[PDB]
Amino acid sequence: MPHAFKPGDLVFAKMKGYPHWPARIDDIADGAVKPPPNKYPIFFFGTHETAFLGPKDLFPYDKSKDKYGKPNKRKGFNEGLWEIQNNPHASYS
Length: 93
Prior knowledge:
Blueprint: E1 10-13, E2 21-25, E3 40-44, E4 50-53, E5 58-60, H1 61-68, H2 77-86
Protein name: Hepatoma-derived growth factor-related protein 2
Subcellular location: Nucleus; Cytoplasm
Domain PWWP: 7-64
């Protein structure tokens, strides 16, 4: 059965006005800004941006890739697809 989300989990993450996007749940570094309550730090592959999102916008990668893991025109998307498939746990700073 499913657990709660934890750092390292891979997802497609949904934000208004964008396609479901390859992403991961990030750790929060020591001394770094924490997300609001009930939100997770989401790192978007390809763009390398962070946003704070709740579970309603988080789709587990394995279950969802057949639907959401196809190339898209949007800036950073296809790079994102490579990263999530090939090195999802790397440092992208």
